[PDB]
Amino acid sequence: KIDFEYGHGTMTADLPDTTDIFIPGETVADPECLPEDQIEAATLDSIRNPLGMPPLTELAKPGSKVTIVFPDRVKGGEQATAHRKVSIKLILQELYSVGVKKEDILLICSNGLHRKNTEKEILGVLGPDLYHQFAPTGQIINHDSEDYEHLVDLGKTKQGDPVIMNKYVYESDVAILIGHTQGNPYGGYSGGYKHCSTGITHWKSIASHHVPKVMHRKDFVPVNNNSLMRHKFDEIGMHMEEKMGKKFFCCDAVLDTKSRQIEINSGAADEVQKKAWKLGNARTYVPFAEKKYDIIVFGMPQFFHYGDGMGTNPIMLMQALSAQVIRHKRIMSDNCVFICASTCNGYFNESLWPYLPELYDLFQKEGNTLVDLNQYGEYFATNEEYIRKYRYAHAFHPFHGFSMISCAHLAEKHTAAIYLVGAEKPGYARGMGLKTRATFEEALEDAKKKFVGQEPNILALPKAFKTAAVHLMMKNDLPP
Amino acid sequence: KIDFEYGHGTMTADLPDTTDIFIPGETVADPECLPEDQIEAATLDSIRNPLGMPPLTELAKPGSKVTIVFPDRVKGGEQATAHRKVSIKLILQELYSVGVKKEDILLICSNGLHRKNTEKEILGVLGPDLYHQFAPTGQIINHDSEDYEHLVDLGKTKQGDPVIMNKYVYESDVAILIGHTQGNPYGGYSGGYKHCSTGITHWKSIASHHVPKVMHRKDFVPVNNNSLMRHKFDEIGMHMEEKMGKKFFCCDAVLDTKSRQIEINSGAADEVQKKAWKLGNARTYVPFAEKKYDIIVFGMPQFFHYGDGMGTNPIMLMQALSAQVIRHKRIMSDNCVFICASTCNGYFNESLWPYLPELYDLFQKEGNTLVDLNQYGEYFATNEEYIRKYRYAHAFHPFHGFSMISCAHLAEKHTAAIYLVGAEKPGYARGMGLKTRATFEEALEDAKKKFVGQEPNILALPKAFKTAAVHLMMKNDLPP
Amino acid sequence: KIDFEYGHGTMTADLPDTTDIFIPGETVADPECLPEDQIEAATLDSIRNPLGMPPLTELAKPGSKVTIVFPDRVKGGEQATAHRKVSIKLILQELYSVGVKKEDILLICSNGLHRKNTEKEILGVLGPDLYHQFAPTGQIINHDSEDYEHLVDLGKTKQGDPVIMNKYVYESDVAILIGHTQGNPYGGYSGGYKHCSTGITHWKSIASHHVPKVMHRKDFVPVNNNSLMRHKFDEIGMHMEEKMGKKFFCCDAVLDTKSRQIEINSGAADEVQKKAWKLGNARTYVPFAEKKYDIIVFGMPQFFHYGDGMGTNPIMLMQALSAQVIRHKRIMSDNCVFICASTCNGYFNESLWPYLPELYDLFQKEGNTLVDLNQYGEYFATNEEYIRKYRYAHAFHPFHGFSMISCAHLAEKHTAAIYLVGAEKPGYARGMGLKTRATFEEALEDAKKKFVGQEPNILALPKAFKTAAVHLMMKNDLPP
Amino acid sequence: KIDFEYGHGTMTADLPDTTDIFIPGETVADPECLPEDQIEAATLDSIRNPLGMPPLTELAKPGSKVTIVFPDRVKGGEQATAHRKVSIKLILQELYSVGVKKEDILLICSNGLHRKNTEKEILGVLGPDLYHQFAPTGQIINHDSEDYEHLVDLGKTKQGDPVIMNKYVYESDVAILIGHTQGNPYGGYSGGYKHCSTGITHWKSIASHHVPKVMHRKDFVPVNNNSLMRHKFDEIGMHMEEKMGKKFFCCDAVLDTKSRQIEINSGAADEVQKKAWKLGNARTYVPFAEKKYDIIVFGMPQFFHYGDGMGTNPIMLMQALSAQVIRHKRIMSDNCVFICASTCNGYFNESLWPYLPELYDLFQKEGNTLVDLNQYGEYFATNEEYIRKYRYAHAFHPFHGFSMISCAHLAEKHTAAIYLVGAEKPGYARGMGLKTRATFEEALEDAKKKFVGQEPNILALPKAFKTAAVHLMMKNDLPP
């Protein structure tokens, strides 16, 4: 009896007593996070002694325009001592010390193609103090990847990747990036060059890497720190750095499963990435599996990663399954079977993803596999209604969904079969290529009969999505 | 490089040179069909010398009411020397020899839950001679399982099985069942007791055996001559014989893969079944395979079996896949993979199956598997509009579709995965639980990577639905 | 420059000066119609001296139930001296002369499958005298072919023809059929045995002869007095006479092109038909053409024959074209081309023919030719909503439309091509299989280029539908 | 017994034994294709020895911008030694030899109003080597006739033809057109000035000749080499040539039925056309017919020419019929009949042609003939949704459909009747003015009865659309 996430709660699975249960942070201890009394001091020390650039004192002159670009509510923590709040607070104190005016500081939420964070979401992300400091003056803005008035086209990179970036960050004298060095199937880790290359860029810039051309090759599944997606992240980052004539001050903190800071690294994006990747690999790449697992059992809540309906939207849940594939491919056998509890009730969450019903209909009409949809990316990404919903209705940018399906296809690709149990509308899961069973037990027996045999190595991931999911490797494997 | 049925033509698969190809009737020779000149003599000898039941001349008095119940266009063949035409002509000659009035003979098409054969279809089935002999007088009637003015309820059997049969057959004094002892996933063979128990019955009688409670038991896959399905067929047949006060004259011919008569058997249904079962097993239960087959590759044409759209309608498509499962389970590995070519263009053929769009939508809304739909059988079977379309619009009876899903779930249950290639609308195939690939090669590589390994035993089945399919067994297997 | 019917008016065709113009009743003189002064005297003499049946005075006992079945507004005259009004008035006077009670007389409008005539239409048909004499007491009833409470099933005929007739006519003691001997594509002439067999029967009785099985044989085009259609008419008529125990008093008047009486024939239906055949052939079978006509040019008004939309509804449009084919087949060349003006504006007249939009949609969905629709006849004929609209909303009976398409296919079958000119919505005409051109000149040039050559024999038929059409034959042809 | 294309396969026709069967390349031997070992050498010799201009070495300076404009997947073949792949490879080698940088070379797919080729289609067209060489850097772009950022308006010609052309080709120092001098009803042949005038121009430029005002005159049907369409092609080509100050280097190869190279010619467009014209006339204009054919029998596959649904979309199907008309006018009698097998199942392929459902509805509700639609061309061509689907959803440009109907009208104009055989939804074929018959035999008998007589000259074209269809002439006719 193992409880797995099911929509809003838990559904029980009668898994065998030999099933291995892994919970991030719990089953294998993450690197010890900084104590609460020490988190602020560590962040201040990181800011005051950066890597690859002089501190914010030398970079910022009195009266200089400063853009502090912080990540949205998808990643990071919202506690009183969260990395975003503490880091932005001490960075603002440092800026005020050197004479940088408060009215000349812009807090930019790096949603990128994700939904623009609402006022309450921004308040929760930044904390009451920072929000009430900057929101009344309009000094907290969500990045708009479709507001070309506040976007600068920087041309293409040496590899042909277009670069359109946030105008406030472009014209600012000091661009600071609050980042979380958390485990991410997209490029290995969040923050660093990924933060700038995605959260404050265009869908066209993101289309260079968030496509099957780079995330359906060998280097993406399982993810590493030197995949093509991360390479394009770095390329776009340094391209914008050359275009502005300045480099991003990347205040990035490695976070544990509970989004608590383990270490904080500030300075140059590449220096910060290199310095933080050691602890990021100690926390994210967990050598836990003693044997390859034939069945991976987990549960999908309705609201884990990108908001409500993330575990009920067929495309969003397929992308979550694919993210699990990228995370645990190192411990997955060739014929691995995913058994996921999801309330696939047809709740697409059109408020969050208005384009996803039409993307799903396009997949049903044309696509044998989700990769067949990639040709329509721009078609959604230039859709005026979806663009308007992203810009004003706090919806995800349309092209994000293609990134989603660009990830989601790996779920169909790298698993023998994926079982979705408890689907209230199993037709949507089947339309995403998932086998549908009413309960965990029937899917378990079906997988044993068809793909994995009567004595499979079953891995249970009860908190696969409600927690910061680590990427599992073999016990003898070393963190890449 | 093997062509497989695909819509109205063929799709070519670049299968490995080690792929074994089986064409029913060509790869393994059928029992030698009777010559065209000898067919009439053999049928006349069988009719004049029936088994375990008095000859037709000894059953019908002058002025007797005779019902010749012939099968519909789905099986039997429509050649000049087809069993239906020749057998009915000789039987009518014998009846006129004992002075049976022509006006007292009714030709009943035993569609059962299948669509009432149109006048053109009846003409093609019976030959111009028989048609223009009996059609202008209105003596050829399609059996109506929903015309209760022409239905007689015989009550429950000894096992509580509801029997409602055609009123013309019940009230006649001589009922002559024209039958084809041909390979059939339902009950082993066609004709005999199955002919009466299905073709001239109510949907409630079919619900007794076409329920998953009888189709999904361990004795149905692969189908044999002693399955529960045939048991209910026989029970309903002898219930008819007891309530009617007369015995069916089962003029049955064993047919090869080209619908040519090999031997004609007349007399009581039980005796005809016992005598013709040996040659039926010789023709159908073919001991061909020397090894278990990991991949079974075939193609689905748009038109086959029940009519147009059978290879495109998702539910009929799954029923055809499950029929293949039933027929070839003896040569299948536990992780067997189906790779079928089907256009799957969303052509439900509402004229043939108007209830099937609603059934598919119900499957998507509620059903994890197709068995979840069975509780709605009566709901479709009593649907007024679908009943009207079956009675007058020459549509299939609604409950027949449930029989299909009752069969079709087996395709999901037994195969590890079924690949559909060439799907114009892959969404319907995926909503049936099928993996969708654009071409045969992609599905083959996917099956090799996921289920069967890089060196699978691949069986090619070209014309698997164009010709009368056989039940493939291992070389050392004995015919049931 | 000849004006042809077009919607509510005329369209001019710049036909060659060699075009022959035929106007029924004008180009060839009709038999001299009875002048208004002696019309009453002739009708009274015919009624008092019937043919092969006793006079009405010798048939109706005092206080006996009498049903006067008069035809609807589709055919016959509506003037003061119209056959229906005068004949019914004189018959009622004769009945009152022998003491037959006024209350015991029922005036039945024999619509059959045609729309029940409204109270206004019944008044116009019967005259104010007869209407206000019998309407206020409810003694004028439209025949309801779907009011089984007022229908009597007489069973199949000797030819297997189902007969269900009006209950009032069946249960009456004297049934008097008012009839018009006029040019009719159905059965040669109207009235007589056709009157009873169609105007007061069930749709099942009409289905015996109004299907392609009877309308599309070689003996129907051109139509005569010895076609199979007339044979079924006679068989159903004598079946009605035999089951009733009484003989129809067929008070029939031969009508010219202006619906004026030429001679009145009363008595048995067979004897009346024999007596009136000569003058019916003289009026209808006109030997006018001295050569075969390659192009037949006529115009279709919006209102004619069955009512509004007849020239605009695609199916009634094809039925009118096929009626023209049937009437003018004797003068038609093998490759004859019809060029018809019609406002094919998509006005289906759902009030008149609610089943016809569905019938046309079915034809587009699966009908290569209109005969492909015949299998659905009962499906429309048993449709509850269409039956309700026929019974209460004064709509045509659904199966009547099938009769129309049963006729209408002839237009497709016999003409090389039919050109519709002036169609506001040419798509409906094309979906009926008609070539569409904007003007008469374009269609004429197209027909000359494609089928008939640059010097065709063009026949102009203005008012081909406004006047009672004739069956044109060659000058040397004899009248059947 | 001749098999003609039907949907995804073939259907059989019981044509008379006197029916003449023509297959391009097979029935009449095409000019001998260049051997595979000699194709590359001949292409290199052609590029190194151009006509009308100096070679690419003398035209391209080191660092000069070069646009290699290649045709889409519709024609040209995709074999390993196809003209596009080999020609582009050797041309790139020559450019690298003279010092032209790889980053300064743009591979432009000249889709024109045709759908932008997807990444997979571009890969298949160009070969894996060329694709992976230029695709990752974004150096392969589809021509966008609606991206005015990358379009240059060159004004009108001397005849008022608007000229808007691809901006990359305009600003490039060397424009190299890869061309296929294969049979084409549009202007006689592809490549040369047609390639530039259509594949990299605006819909407004194409509207000068793709309207009925140009392709419905005497010269277009039958197509010749001096038709007005080719004249306007030449005019637009030289207009763009003078506008850029450079002339197109037309590397054009003549192709056989199997798209294999027969002769490769490079240099100026007019000189290339003149040189390749003899081979193009030898391969394309085949003097095969000994007598004019009253019936031409062929069949449409679902996929051919412009993609999926070409044989099922009613407008696309009718345009294919018209292309056959233009191809075989020289061997076609005045009362010619087309009998084409097509699965006219209503599959419009909205993905390929989203505007064609609404264009078809416009034809049904307004158009007597297809020319009546031409006034709405710009209305579709400026439709924002259809433009977006062409630009991003890989759909055909809207105005292309009008070109299609501009061709398609000839099918109605130059044939007495066209019989569409086996239509699943015959209403669409009838709405395109085509006679619909269920089987080949029905259409054959109908055509014999109506248009061509009982002993017609029947031509069979079993591979009319699955191969590069030649234009047939009389055996005494010289190639124009």
Ligand SMILES: *C(=S)c1cc(C(=O)S)c[n+]([C@@H]2O[C@H](COP(=O)(O)O)[C@@H](O)[C@H]2O)c1
């Ligand atoms: C990672 S792929 C990523 C992608 C996007 C897109 O728009 S696609 C946006 N972001 C934003 O960058 C911040 C932190 O990155 P993380 O990897 O999501 O944790 C955050 O604001 C993201 O929304 C990231």
Ligand SMILES: *C(=S)c1cc(C(=O)S)c[n+]([C@@H]2O[C@H](COP(=O)(O)O)[C@@H](O)[C@H]2O)c1
């Ligand atoms: C087989 S299970 C079967 C089922 C039905 C139903 O209605 S369910 C009807 N029939 C008819 O019986 C005839 C011959 O049987 P066959 O197995 O189809 O060959 C024939 O008329 C069937 O339609 C059979």
Ligand SMILES: *C(=S)c1cc(C(=O)S)c[n+]([C@@H]2O[C@H](COP(=O)(O)O)[C@@H](O)[C@H]2O)c1
């Ligand atoms: C002629 S076929 C016919 C058919 C019908 C049908 O219902 S179908 C009905 N009637 C009616 O009989 C009366 C006179 O016949 P006529 O040929 O129409 O003049 C008249 O009331 C008809 O409506 C006739």
Ligand SMILES: *C(=S)c1cc(C(=O)S)c[n+]([C@@H]2O[C@H](COP(=O)(O)O)[C@@H](O)[C@H]2O)c1
């Ligand atoms: C021929 S008329 C033609 C028309 C167009 C239009 O947009 S209309 C486009 N093209 C493209 O030019 C290339 C080769 O020409 P072909 O005649 O098709 O072989 C090719 O890319 C065409 O798509 C041609």
Ligand code: NI
């Ligand atoms: Ni992203």
Ligand code: NI
């Ligand atoms: Ni059955």
Ligand code: NI
């Ligand atoms: Ni009638």
Ligand code: NI
């Ligand atoms: Ni073109």
